[PDB]
Design a protein around this ligand. Structure first.
Ligand SMILES: CC(=O)Nc1ccc(Nc2ccccc2)cc1
Ligand code: NI
Length: 341
């Protein structure tokens, strides 16, 4: 059955609720972003209205084959009316096409659903700033003070500098980047840009990236693996066996692999700095795990919530255990008291 935290009170709406069959009294289904835990259940046989961003709509049509007559894309930062309720889609700073949703209830209640997000001070100057928000449905993935990570900018500088050094020392080294979903495209695009190369990948991945409205994408990506010295592979293949196998398939064009896994967090963050990250190495293969997050750190989340000052907070992640629920509630109370309420 559909959990309470995917239901929007006083409306016919659900959010990211496609795996529960037909939901009782749901007149419109919202999808915040194209990640499988959120879209699970959608297909060509879905015949209810789906509301989403333009990019999410492109992916629904082309990857899942949802019929166009049931896809309702909305522009960002624009007041729209859906089944008689005013809504706004805001950029979530997660993966391409990911949104937060503002709902203005007929009775005057205002609700923000963050979907998945990485909180940023730039959000403090969107349409959020223009009215009080009463209820917040919050992405609490990393809601604990141990979750510190660097900026995306610092992590990308590290990856660019590491790749440029390696390939300048050895022109016969291949760079490989792991992927298993949309998001974190900057990792492989910034590396390819510093090496003067296109990124090579499967036909299926190339199709996915063509759905994203990235400027000048025909200029950065390719299915011609032979022309490219940055290759994308499934995340499952980023290990010594998988990479040894790939190197054999390149026909003696390359004699070394430098590979990146762009993981969310790793307990190395609790001890170590970004400058101090080191690879796992075996023979002519090195694997770097880099802390590229598309979710809020604890401090970023805290700042957003103390700025917004909602009346009620409803977590949407880590809700399955009493210990996690209790821990999150205690942090919310701390944040409230520190702000003076
Ligand atoms: C679980 C639940 O609903 N509790 C709750 C709700 C709202 C706040 N709001 C707040 C936070 C920081 C600063 C000013 C207000 C804090 C805790
Ligand atoms: Ni996500």
């Amino acid at each position: 059955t559909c959990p309470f935290y995917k239901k929007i009170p006083g409306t016919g709406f659900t959010v990211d609720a496609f795996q529960y069959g037909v939901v009782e009294g749901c007149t419109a289904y919202f999808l915040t972003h194209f990640h499988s835990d959120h879209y699970a259940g959608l297909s060509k046989h879905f015949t209810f209205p789906v509301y989403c961003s333009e990019i999410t709509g492109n992916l629904l049509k082309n990857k899942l084959h949802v019929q166009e007559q049931y896809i309702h894309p909305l522009p960002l930062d624009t007041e729209c009316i859906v089944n008689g309720v005013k809504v706004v889609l805001l950029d979530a700073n997660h993966c391409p096409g990911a949104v937060m949703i503002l709902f203005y209830l007929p009775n005057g209640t205002v609700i923000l659903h963050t979907g998945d997000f990485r909180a940023d001070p730039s959000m403090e100057r969107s349409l959020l700033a223009d009215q009080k928000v009463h209820m917040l449905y919050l992405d609490t993935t990393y809601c604990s003070p141990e979750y510190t990570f660097p900026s995306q900018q610092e992590v990308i500088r590290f990856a660019i500098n590491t790749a440029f050094e390696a390939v300048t020392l050895n022109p016969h080294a291949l760079v490989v980047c792991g992927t298993y979903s949309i998001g974190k495209e900057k990792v492989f695009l910034a590396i390819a840009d510093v090496l003067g190369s296109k990124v090579g990948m499967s036909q299926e991945k190339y199709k996915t990236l063509q759905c994203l409205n990235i400027p000048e994408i025909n200029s950065l990506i390719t299915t011609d693996m032979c022309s490219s010295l940055v290759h994308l592979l499934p995340m499952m293949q980023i290990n010594f066996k998988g990479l040894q196998s790939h190197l054999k398939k390149c026909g003696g064009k390359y004699n070394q692999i430098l590979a990146f896994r762009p993981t969310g967090w790793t307990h190395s963050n609790k001890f170590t700095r970004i400058a101090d990250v080191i690879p796992q190495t075996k023979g002519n293969i090195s694997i770097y795990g880099i802390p590229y997050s598309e979710h809020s750190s604890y401090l970023e989340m805290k700042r957003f919530v103390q700025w917004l000052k909602p009346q009620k907070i409803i977590p949407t992640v880590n809700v399955g255990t009493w210990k996690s629920r209790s821990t999150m509630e205690k942090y919310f109370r701390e944040w409230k008291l520190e702000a003076g309420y």
